[PDB]
Amino acid sequence: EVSQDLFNQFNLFAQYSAAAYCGKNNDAPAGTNITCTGNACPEVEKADATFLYSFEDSGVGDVTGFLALDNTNKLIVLSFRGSRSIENWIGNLNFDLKEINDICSGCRGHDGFTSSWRSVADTLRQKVEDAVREHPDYRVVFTGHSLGGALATVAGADLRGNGYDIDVFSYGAPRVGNRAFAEFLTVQTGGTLYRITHTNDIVPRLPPREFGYSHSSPEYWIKSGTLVPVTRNDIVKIEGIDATGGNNQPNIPDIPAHLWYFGLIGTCL
Amino acid sequence: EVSQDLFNQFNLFAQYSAAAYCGKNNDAPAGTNITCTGNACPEVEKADATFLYSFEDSGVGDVTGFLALDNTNKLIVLSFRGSRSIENWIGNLNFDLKEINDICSGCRGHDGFTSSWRSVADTLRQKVEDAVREHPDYRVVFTGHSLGGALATVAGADLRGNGYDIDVFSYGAPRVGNRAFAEFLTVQTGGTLYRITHTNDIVPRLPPREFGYSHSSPEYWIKSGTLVPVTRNDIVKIEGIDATGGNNQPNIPDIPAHLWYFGLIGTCL
Numbered sequence: 001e002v003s004q005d006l007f008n009q010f011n012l013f014a015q016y017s018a019a020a021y022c023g024k025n026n027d028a029p030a031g032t033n034i035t036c037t038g039n040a041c042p043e044v045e046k047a048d049a050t051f052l053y054s055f056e057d058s059g060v061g062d063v064t065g066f067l068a069l070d071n072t073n074k075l076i077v078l079s080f081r082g083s084r085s086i087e088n089w090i091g092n093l094n095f096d097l098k099e100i101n102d103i104c105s106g107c108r109g110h111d112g113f114t115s116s117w118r119s120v121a122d123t124l125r126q127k128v129e130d131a132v133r134e135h136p137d138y139r140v141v142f143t144g145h146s147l148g149g150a151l152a153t154v155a156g157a158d159l160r161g162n163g164y165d166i167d168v169f170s171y172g173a174p175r176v177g178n179r180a181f182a183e184f185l186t187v188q189t190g191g192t193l194y195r196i197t198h199t200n201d202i203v204p205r206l207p208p209r210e211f212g213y214s215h216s217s218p219e220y221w222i223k224s225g226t227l228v229p230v231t232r233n234d235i236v237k238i239e240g241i242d243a244t245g246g247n248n249q250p251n252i253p254d255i256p257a258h259l260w261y262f263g264l265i266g267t268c269l
Numbered sequence: 270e271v272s273q274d275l276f277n278q279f280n281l282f283a284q285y286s287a288a289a290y291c292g293k294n295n296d297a298p299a300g301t302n303i304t305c306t307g308n309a310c311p312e313v314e315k316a317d318a319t320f321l322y323s324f325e326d327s328g329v330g331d332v333t334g335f336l337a338l339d340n341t342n343k344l345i346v347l348s349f350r351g352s353r354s355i356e357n358w359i360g361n362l363n364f365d366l367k368e369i370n371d372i373c374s375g376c377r378g379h380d381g382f383t384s385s386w387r388s389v390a391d392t393l394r395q396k397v398e399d400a401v402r403e404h405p406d407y408r409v410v411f412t413g414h415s416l417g418g419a420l421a422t423v424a425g426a427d428l429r430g431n432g433y434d435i436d437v438f439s440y441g442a443p444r445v446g447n448r449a450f451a452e453f454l455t456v457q458t459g460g461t462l463y464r465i466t467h468t469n470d471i472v473p474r475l476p477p478r479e480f481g482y483s484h485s486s487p488e489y490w491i492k493s494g495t496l497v498p499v500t501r502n503d504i505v506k507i508e509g510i511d512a513t514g515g516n517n518q519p520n521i522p523d524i525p526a527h528l529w530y531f532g533l534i535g536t537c538l
């Protein structure tokens with residue numbers, strides 16, 4: 001029974017996430033208005049929102065995304081793009097873990113996702129801190145769909161505790177590491193993670209539990225269909241690390257369900 | 270206005286049109302159930318609907334689509350697919366008109382669309398007539414999106430007046446010929462043409478009028494945006510050969526608006 005207010009924020013960061021794929025320019029000047037093709041982010045376009053910094057193929061893991069200033073919603077938004085070819089990304093996904101003791105003790109995380117974040121963290125923390133110091137009453141939100149949602153979760157876990165709260169809104173994010181990391185992500189203070197999933201989306205089911213992966217609690221499960229508008233009654237809050245009955249159900253998953261989080265996402269008309 | 274009953278046919282033939290692209294099965298042997306990926310054609314899935322015949326790269330013009338038997342709605346549906354690559358197809362669209370005296374006197378048609386149809390006409394007329402002879406109380410409906418909307422319109426014009434009505438439902442169809450042809454399609458007896466357009470979709474604006482092309486009347490104009498659900502009152506019936514104030518407006522057109530007719534069409538999640 002999610003609040004009307006939190007539902008409206010789920011929609012907004014779904015569109016910031018979507019905007020990471022469908023942004024008008026990929027070399028866009030800082031200060032230029034955020035717009036999308038194909039009506040992928042109308043709520044963002046309604047806002048007084050601008051690009052503070054745009055990154056494409058950035059650092060080791062070819063990280064793509066933007067830092068946005070929203071003067072209407074009073075947000076600093078760091079949005080990470082998922083893969084440009086999601087089916088190929090899924091098939092090629094490695095299940096290798098790595099120590100991430102610098103984020104939390106005994107925590108391990110997907111090699112790729114944690115590597116990629118580490119390679120751009122210094123730059124993006126600096127950009128985020130300039131924004132905080134220029135706009136101290138502005139709320140920091142990190143967001144991402146798919147791979148982008150993994151990056152956003154890792155970055156949030158990493159940069160929390162340094163003076164600014166960081167909310168994270170992840171959309172069809174894969175598992176990011178082991179049970180220790182899931183437990184950290186579940187109780188870490190200095191912001192809330194809203195880990196959002198849809199029906200039988202394949203990506204939150206990877207990498208598999210059998211390779212040493214766990215999901216953080218809680219889960220915000222969208223049970224309304226692919227290409228169906230989402231009502232507030234359509235979101236189910238599921239508590240427990242590796243809880244089942246949401247997206248973690250013993251049935252055949254689906255790629256199309258990955259591309260529909262409140263609206264079209266991870267692809268551009 | 271349009272009745273709720275007509276709004277439901279528009280939504281059903283939009284999904285029969287969508288299925289020409291997202292047809293879950295290309296194996297697709299006669300008698301197999303119609304299903305789509307990505308929730309593209311749920312109303313078709315609900316119906317007892319089967320492939321009577323399926324064609325790919327058919328004839329000179331490489332016509333693709335299927336002939337369906339629907340025992341729930343009692344339909345014989347010929348569904349033509351538009352292009353695999355609509356943006357490429359829009360850019361390479363040649364405006365050459367061909368004499369089509371054979372279908373109506375003084376009529377000229379798009380050389381491509383009319384040549385394409387003529388090359389599969391004998392084979393496909395025999396398949397509909399076979400289907401009509403076994404199910405004479407069934408309604409014959411030709412439908413398609415984009416290039417598919419044009420093929421259906423030409424097929425309709427050509428095969429009508431042979432003992433069965435042919436209703437045509439086109440989605441974002443281009444202009445198919447000159448004013449003589451547009452007039453023939455406005456008054457032809459032996460079924461109705463439902464020519465449906467969306468906001469500022471580019472495709473119903475091609476080929477241009479200044480290449481001697483005209484639209485048949487009427488036009489059913491969807492005013493609701495891209496990725497927005499369509500309500501009955503969002504559809505405006507616009508009367509008049511080459512009427513303006515629907516899709517035929519002197520503003521900047523849009524490709525994404527081509528891919529949203531009631532839902533996702535001409536593309537498959």
Ligand SMILES: *[C@@H]1O[C@H](CO)[C@@H](O)[C@H](O)[C@H]1NC(C)=O
Binds near residue numbers: 048
């Ligand atoms: C950018 O957005 C601002 C605030 O939303 C608006 O007032 C201005 O007209 C926009 N600039 C451009 C280039 O459209």
Ligand SMILES: *[C@@H]1O[C@H](CO)[C@@H](O)[C@H](O)[C@H]1NC(C)=O
Binds near residue numbers: 318
């Ligand atoms: C096809 O649909 C029919 C009628 O709705 C049904 O009897 C049958 O179970 C379906 N076939 C398959 C392969 O699902």
Ligand SMILES: [Mg+2]
Binds near residue numbers: 046048049
């Ligand atoms: Mg704006």
Ligand SMILES: [Mg+2]
Binds near residue numbers: 443444445454464483
């Ligand atoms: Mg016409």
